[PDB]
C-alpha cells in the first residue's frame, strides 16, 4: 500500500532528515 511504500522509502531513499 501507498503508505506503507512511503514510510518504508523514509528508511531505505529517504532525504529530509539526513540533514547534515
Given at each position: 500500500?501507498?503508505?506503507?511504500?512511503?514510510a518504508?522509502?523514509?528508511?531505505?531513499?529517504?532525504?529530509?532528515?539526513?540533514?547534515?
Open positions: 500500500g501507498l503508505f506503507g511504500a512511503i518504508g522509502f523514509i528508511e531505505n531513499g529517504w532525504e529530509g532528515m539526513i540533514d547534515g
